[PDB]
Symmetry: D2
Subunit: 242 residues, 4 copies
C-alpha cells in the first residue's frame, strides 16, 4: 500500500516493552526491517524473539543512547549486517523530585541529539529519512511529576522543530509524538486514586493503548506524511497537561 | 465482522468543500479507504463536478449542495444523507468563505467558526447515537504573500486550534474525536500564479524546499479518520513542510 | 430616576498617565474594580462601567473614596447602540479614551461564551480605534475573564478559550500597530474572591496544590500587570498574552 | 492606594552581561528603581565600564568579572558578592555563551542558567523572596531564535514550579528586534523588509526591554511566575 515501509530499515530504541515494543511491531507490520534496542543482552534477545513471534524481519541489539561509543559501534554494526537505518524512533529515555526535571530533560535531549546526529549521515546520503521522537507518558505522582511532564514535552517540541529546520532540505522529516496516559507496565499498577484522578481529566474516559501511539508513529514514518515536519502530535485522549 | 487498519469500509463520510483542491483530494482519499463519500459545494455545478469526480474514481457516494452558513441547508443536507445513504460518522470541514488587507481576519474567522459550530452540532446527534465519530477541521492555506497574508493565516489557525480543542473536550466521552489539519503553503490556484522571484523567496522559507500537495493533506486526514487515530483528539496537525507562522 | 452617569495639589509619584482617559469595562467588583483603582493610582481619569445604574453609582462611590477623578457609567459591550452612544457621551464630557481595558464579559456554553465575548472585544476595540488613531497612541488590554480564560471560570474551557483570546489579541495587535496602539491580554489564574474563599477546606487545599506559589492571586496583582501594560514603558509589548497565575498553567 | 513598593530600595540585584545594550539598560533601570546593582562582564575592561556607568548614573553597586559557563567562576563571584555587598535577591540572566549550532547554543545556555540559578537560590530561600528573570536572545536566524526561545520558556516554567513555594518568581523576557549591535549595520532593503514584519514599524529600544524587567522585579509582579513575556513590537516567530 501507500503506508508501506517495504525496503526500509528502522531503528527503534527502547523496544523491549511498552510503547517502544508496539512501535517496533507496527513498523514491522508496514514492512520495515526493524532493529529494536535494549540496554541489556537479555533485552535484545527478547526483542528478537518478539519480532519472530510477529513475523517481523530484523534484530535486537544492545544500545546505550547515553554513550557516544555505544552509538557509533551500534550504527556500524547495523550498517554492516542490515543496512542504513532511514527510519529512527527515539523512544529510550535514561517519586520524581521537584528539582530533578532539569537533569532528566537535559540528559534525554542530549541523547536525542547524539543518536540523531549519528543516523543523519545515512539519511543525508539517501536524501530521505524519518526521525520520530517519543515523549514521556503521563502518570508520575506529585507536582514533581507534572513539572517533569511539562518540562520534557517543552524540550521535546523545541528540539524537534529545530532539528526539522536543520535537515529539511534533505527530505528528512523530524517529528515527535507526545503521549498522554497510556496503559504500560509503568502505569498499570499506579495507585488507584491517581489512576482515577487522571481518568477524570481525560475526555475519552480511558487510558490509551501502546498501539495507539504506534499507529501515529507508523503514519509519520510513511510517504503520506512527507510534508509533516517539525510537528509534535499529542496522543492523549484530549487531556493536555502543561 | 471486518477489522483492518486504515479501512473506512461501512462508514459514510461528509466532506464539505469537495469540488477542488484539498477538499477533492480528501474526498478521493476517504473513498480509497472504503468510505461512502458525500462531497459538498455551494453550487449545483460544484455538486455535479463532485459526483462526476467520485464516479470516475470508483468511489460510491454523491455530490450535494450545502451552505454551511444556513441552518436550513445543514438540516436539509443531513436529512438527505440519512434517508439515502446513512448517518455520516466522518465529517471533514473544508468549506470556508482589492488586495488582501490585515483587517479582514475577524470577519473571516468569526464567520467560519460560527458555520463550523453549526455543522458540527448538527452531525453530533448521529455520532452520539453511534457512540463513534470523527470530525476533522481543515485550516486555511496561506492566502497571500506579505503581512496581511500572515496576519489572516495565523488568526484563522489560532481560531481553528482553540475551537477544535474545546469541541474535542465536549464530545470525547462519546468516543468522537475532533482534530484539525493546518496546511502551510500548498500547491493551489494562488500559488500556481505567483512570479518566479516570489515563488523562490517563498520556497526559501520552507525547510522542505517545496510546496505541499493537496494529497499530502488528504493522507493526514485519512489517518485521523482511521481507528488507529482513536486516541488523538483535540489536536491540530501542522502540514507545512517546516514553515511555522503564528 | 435611574441615572446612568455618576461622577467621582497633591502630586503622587505614581502618576504617569497624566490624566489620559481610561475606560475599564466591568469595574463594579473584583479584578475590574482593582484595575480601575490601579489606573487611578497611575494618574488616569478613570471611567469604570457596569450594565446597571446601581453598578455605575457603586463605581463612582469607589472612585470617590479613593480620590480618583472619573465616572461610573452604564455600558453594554454586547450592544452596538450602547457602545456607540456611550463612547460619544464619554468623548463629549470627559475626552477620548486612549486606554481601554476589556473586563466585562458574559459567562453550547463551550462555544457561545468565547464567541460572544470575542465579538464584544472586537466591537468595543473597533469603536475606540478612531480616537487612538487620531492621537497616534493607544492601549487595549483584554482580561481573560471575558472568554473564561481565567482560572476562576474553571479548568474545563480554559486552554481552548485562552488560545482564542491569544490569537484574537495578536491579530488585532498586528492590525493596529502601525498607529502606535498596543493590544495585549492578561490571563489570570485563580484569584481570591468570595467564590474561591467559600470553597471547603479540602477543595481549597487541592486547588492550592496545583499552584506553585501556594496561594490565590489578589485582584490587585492582576491590576498591577494591567497598569504596567498601559504605561509608556510597555510601548514595545504588543500582541502578548501575559499569564498571571502563580505558575498554574492549564492547557 | 497611592503608596506601596513598586521600587527596589534595599534590594541587591545581579545582572549578568551588563556592559552594553540590553544588559546595561537593565542594570540602569534596576538602579533607578533603587536597587544596589552588581553588573557582570567577561573581561576586566567590561567590569570597569560597568562600574563607571553605574557611578555616572548614581547607582550603587559594582562591576565584576563573571564567566557563567564556569562553575568555579560562578561560585567565586557569588561568594565575593555575599561577603562584600549582600545576597542578590533579583538576578537577571543576560550573559550569553558563544558556541547545526542551535543545539549547543541552547544546551550550553540552559546549563548556564541552571548553574547560576541554583547558586543564587540559597540566598533567596533564606530571604523567602526572590526574582529570577531570564533574558532571551534577540533577533537559520529563525531556527536559532525560536529554539533558544523554546528552551527558555520550558526551562523558566519548570524552575518557576520548583521554587514557587518559596515566594521566588522565575520569568523570561523574549526580545524581538532591538536597536543594538547587529541591526545598526543592516542594509536598507533588509531593514525595510524587517520593519515590515514588525507591526509597530520600528526596532525596540534596550530601555523598552529594561522597563519590562523592572516591572517583573517589583512586588506588583508577585503573582507572575513561569511566564515568558515577548517584547517584540508584534513580530512573533515560532
Amino acid at each position: 500500500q501507500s503506508m508501506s515501509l517495504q525496503g526500509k530499515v528502522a531503528l527503534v530504541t527502547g523496544a523491549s516493552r511498552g510503547i517502544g515494543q508496539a512501535i517496533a511491531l507496527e513498523l514491522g507490520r508496514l514492512g520495515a526491517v526493524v532493529i529494536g534496542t535494549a540496554t541489556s543482552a537479555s533485552g535484545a534477545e527478547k526483542i528478537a524473539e518478539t519480532l519472530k513471534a510477529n513475523g517481523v524481519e530484523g534484530a535486537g541489539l544492545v544500545l546505550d543512547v547515553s554513550s557516544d561509543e555505544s552509538v557509533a559501534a551500534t550504527l556500524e554494526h547495523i550498517q554492516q549486517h542490515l543496512g542504513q537505518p532511514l527510519i529512527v524512533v527515539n523512544n529510550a529515555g535514561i517519586r520524581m523530585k521537584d528539582d530533578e526535571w532539569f537533569d532528566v530533560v537535559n540528559t534525554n535531549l542530549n541523547s536525542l541529539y547524539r543518536l540523531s546526529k549519528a543516523v543523519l549521515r545515512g539519511m543525508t546520503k539517501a536524501r530521505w529519512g524519518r526521525i520520530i521522537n517519543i515523549g514521556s507518558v503521563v502518570g508520575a505522582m506529585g507536582n514533581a511529576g507534572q513539572t517533569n511532564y511539562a518540562a520534557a514535552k517543552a524540550g521535546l517540541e523545541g528540539f524537534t522543530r529545530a532539528l526539522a529546520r536543520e535537515v529539511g532540505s534533505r527530505a528528512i522529516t523530524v517529528n515527535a509524538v507526545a503521549p498522554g496516559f497510556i496503559d504500560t507496565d509503568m502505569t498499570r499498577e499506579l495507585p488507584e486514586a491517581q489512576r482515577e484522578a487522571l481518568l477524570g481529566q481525560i475526555p475519552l474516559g480511558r487510558l490509551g493503548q501502546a498501539e495507539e501511539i504506534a499507529k501515529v508513529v507508523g503514519f509519520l514514518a510513511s510517504d503520506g506524511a512527507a510534508y509533516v515536519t517539525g510537528a509534535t502530535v499529542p496522543v492523549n485522549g484530549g487531556m493536555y497537561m502543561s
